[PDB]
Design a protein around this ligand. Structure first.
Ligand SMILES: [Zn+2]
Ligand SMILES: [Zn+2]
Ligand SMILES: [Zn+2]
Ligand SMILES: [Zn+2]
Lengths: 357, 355, 356, 357
């Protein structure tokens, strides 16, 4: 067996948010449009069909899922639309599967693999990982407005680089462990998925630095565009069709630490990728090359870079217990997983990183 | 700008046909299941919240059959069009669903073309002369590939599939070098290009292994890889990167009666080799592609598609149809004229006859 | 975790059978020296400490393990000594573990990986695979008289190459599936073990043609010595320390067909190795090179080379069911193992080999 | 035309395996004399059908101690000698096992040398001057390596092991080029198995040494540490016994005549002696340099000053060289013509070359 899933339609073009309504119309009659707080005003202005606009509470947790879900039943919504980062998108997704509504995602930032996948992640109200839901349907359409996306602070693009950085390495773990992907109901990876995942790593090495340099200067270039697709299309297609591993599992456990709450999903995953490499005891040169790559774009490569500086061995112990709960994605790793091993991998990565100047 | 499209689900596993009903249920309530004739009886048995009407497929994706089949959907009030056959069945279904606003599920019974995954349906005259490639606004909702069903078909169909998939990387490279748009048509996505390229590697790695396997009536991982490459890889590459002279020459070849009995992919395999000549690629790349084609038994000379009499005049005719304004062959990164096309084809046959 | 096991002493020199007692002396005071039938007469004469000499029956099966055991108890046997092929040795080992006797193996042919290993394989009285006993000790000394091994017909040396050939490939299956080896109840493979399995393949491709040609002309050269070592020491260490997989599993299943009874362990395993490759869908070039390598020394590469020619799909169905019993070694393969998957891999390999 | 291989009957490497050691003794005898290093005697005697007398090691492998232990064993009527310590504890245990007809089990507490596997026990004068290397007729029955116990020692002991494993391949290569016999059964050419193991040892060190060091300095046990523990114990032990020693162990032996070098570990001296071998055989500049750099990456000594040797150096090196070149010594396995000046001068030249890097 083997199985692939992806969005019916991915489109990436500057200004495309002005024509967003024109993608909704063929899909439903009643659209609930959910828009991150910061941009709720201008994108309500700017966006046979009526739109209810709702404002997004910031976190993907049960209370907000529920609020928005109740909004939708009353609306009678045909279509859930997510217009924000990954938390907004996942919320629209979860509300959609629950409603029977079609899904459209228009990211406003390229900071995570969430917009393309069938997976939605729920946190507590304090942003502690709760549960990854494997949905049955990918989105109907993903509509990325490059200009919009390239306008955000530079840190949002770098954080997507760091989340996309896990893709190839985590696919490599699932191939070596022969573990299923989350494409419903879960199956071995397709050659298609393996290729996307491999190619995602290549696009990042070729363009990341050039893209980071360009957004910092308020510019939108072909390098930025390549990175937007790598952060969004290649990464989501990869992670969904190949599987997650210890990079994401370590992101999950990192969420138990409060000091970490203000760092982006993509920066924790970047750090978690570096830990996956040490856990699987990869080549020193590969680990060092990834460390230098992360440093070159400003992603974290030491515990200290994610605010973890006091009582570190005890904290990491907590991170590792939470990652290692029976059933978790970290068990996709072609290594024998114990808490001591995951805890000692994170600390060893940290130390080895601390020795590189 | 860039765009990527594909089906929402692709699932490939032995036995899946028996579970096809269960992929229809989440999509609607009234499914119209269009099946190829050879298999109508047996597949209607196995396929039969959800209500199905089964129809027999005539064989051509032509207007009389499309419109005949649409009238049957409107009566049934169908929610879901299911193509169950080869690429004509598939394309028939897709065009009806779009005309009907129904959802689309394809369940191929052979792995002989890249039709099952794409937004492209090709309509032929009732005789099988190319009329029109319709760019549809949706891709399939699900593609459900039953590996055992596909594998037990005569080897020729898997080989015709390798033939069709062979155009993928080479056509994508044609499109990437002319910066023409993929078929809802934008420049190619990175994902698209990476898919296309990978398709060529899977074929070279596994093609001879698969062929040998199916000729002995076996299903192996080499077969499964080829089935994926013939359907998922080939389909995603072609839509997301574009087609070129290989399919143009295919389409041109349809104007000749004596080619009618050959499989789409056998025609496309020949056209790929002509594409290489048209673009004047390396002697060694052309030769190795000729040798790869012969090793699985795909055609490499005009005589292999039976064209043996009045050849220049016929190839002239083929080139004319291929070169009509607006056609896909203009995606070639070369200056396309009817002589260039006609002489590439003849040149390729000449060069192939010299090996 | 990781573990390694091996014999305590491995000595390989022409004429060493004359010195066998000198190796027994320190191991005990009373040795039962089990010898194959062909060589029973000559080697007993050639071979302080007293030794009963028991003739060996041919099969390592329970009726015959028990016979030899009784003799051992009667003897008061201190050291079990196995002088012959793999079956002779497996018996001797099994008796030894039953008795708490020490172990010495003195192979007279280099046709299998048995002499160094902790593994004894039991067959039915008619030679159908029964059970792979994993023993708690390796031999105390393995003593290899090169001159005696190289004097045997060339077929026996080629059968060892056949067996050794599976070592790297089956090690690789186990590494890629992370399956426990056969050391002390089973652990991950040691680096030492992986290095040995790897080198085994290197010595075989380097020296197997030259050794085959040397033994056919009646010669003992350094290339023969190298192959004797790989067939015995490298191949045993690699197998025991890295594990087996579908190549031995398919050999085991082949044992159920009568027509294959005549072929040697090694020629069966050789063929199973090619099947493992097809089963893992390994690169075509690699499958081809190993086919050409098997033909260049006369090892089987088709179903017909094993006598399998009538009703083949049904017979391979049977070999596959037998190989795919629950808990069998074939599951060490980094592939999803089913009877159809195994059956069609053997068939596919057969078809692919028939087209070269 | 002849070859031979010898090795331990079992080698087991797992964290906490010290607790189960008694379970490995049962099958070999009824009566075990357990000889433990000074530092861990208390703690390990209490962690460790069967009757065991416990004895604290003197700390040097020398005749007074061997005799003493030997009398303890006879009084006890020991069936098994177990050395639980470093290579001296191990080597004392073996000599007494062979004089006593006991079986031999070794449970290293540090991975500081390649003694635990081999049939070679080295005797020193009471003050630590090299005295005799005895080739025993038997290898250990079992080597039991408790990875947590070994990894919790100070980093210097693992670094010292790496120094001693570093010589394995270089000395096998000397012995292959001079076609000198090994120390298996009276002496035979290297088996292909021995040669492969020794070469592999060197690959394991280079891949994993720096990651193992960083890890144990952080008080961690990771897979790099596991690999290096095997490299220092199993690989280096099999390689050495099966291919022979040369001038690296010869220069080590000579060094022990100098009082000042007394506080330096066996493995730190062998590291330096291996660099000297390379100069003695006039190996490639780039190979000598890459080893120097490699020793420095893990903090092994690469100059005479690093062994504290800074006054009257030519004269002292003169004394080191005389002692190594005593007739019959293992330095004669080097594929160079061995004289006192050649060795004296290879050492000095290596130092001078190393000061220029
Ligand atoms: Zn993510
Ligand atoms: Zn086509
Ligand atoms: Zn065998
Ligand atoms: Zn040493």
């Amino acid at each position: 067996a083997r199985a692939f899933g992806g969005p019916n339609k991915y489109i990436q073009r500057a200004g495309e948010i002005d024509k967003l309504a024109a993608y909704l119309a063929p899909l439903g009659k009643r659209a609930l449009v959910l828009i991150d707080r910061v941009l709720f005003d201008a994108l309500s202005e700017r966006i046979s069909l009526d739109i209810r606009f709702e404002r997004f509470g910031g976190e993907c947790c049960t209370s907000e899922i529920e609020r928005v879900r109740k909004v939708a039943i009353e609306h009678g919504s045909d279509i859930l639309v997510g217009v924000g980062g990954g938390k907004t998108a996942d919320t629209a997704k979860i509300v959609a599967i629950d409603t029977g509504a079609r899904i459209v995602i228009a990211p406003t930032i390229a900071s995570t693999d969430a917009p393309c996948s069938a997976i939605a992640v729920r946190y507590t109200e304090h942003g502690v990982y709760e549960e990854a839901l494997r949905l049955p349907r990918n989105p109907d359409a993903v509509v990325v407005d490059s200009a919009l996306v390239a306008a955000a602070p530079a840190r949002f693009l770098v954080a997507g680089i760091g989340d996309a950085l896990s893709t190839w390495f985590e696919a490599r773990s699932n191939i070596e462990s022969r573990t299923d992907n989350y494409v419903a109901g879960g199956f071995p990876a397709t050659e298609a998925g393996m290729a996307i995942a491999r190619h995602c790593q290549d696009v990042l090495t070729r363009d990341a630095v050039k893209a980071k340099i360009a957004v910092e200067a308020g510019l939108l270039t072909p390098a930025v565009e390549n990175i937007i697709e790598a952060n969004t299309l290649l990464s989501g297609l990869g992670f969904e069709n190949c599987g997650c591993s210890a990079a994401h599992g370590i992101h999950d456990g990192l969420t138990v630490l409060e000091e970490v709450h203000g760092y982006f999903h993509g920066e924790k995953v970047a750090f978690g990728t570096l830990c996956l490499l040490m856990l699987e005891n990869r080549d020193r040169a590969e680990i060092e090359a990834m460390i230098r790559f992360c440093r070159s774009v400003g992603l974290p490569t030491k515990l200290a870079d994610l605010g973890i500086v006091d009582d570190v061995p005890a904290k990491i112990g907590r991170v590792a217990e939470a990652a290692c709960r029976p059933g978790n994605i970290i068990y996709a790793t072609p290594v024998t997983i114990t808490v001591p091993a995951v805890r000692d991998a994170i600390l060893a990565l940290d130390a080895f990183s601390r020795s590189i100047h």
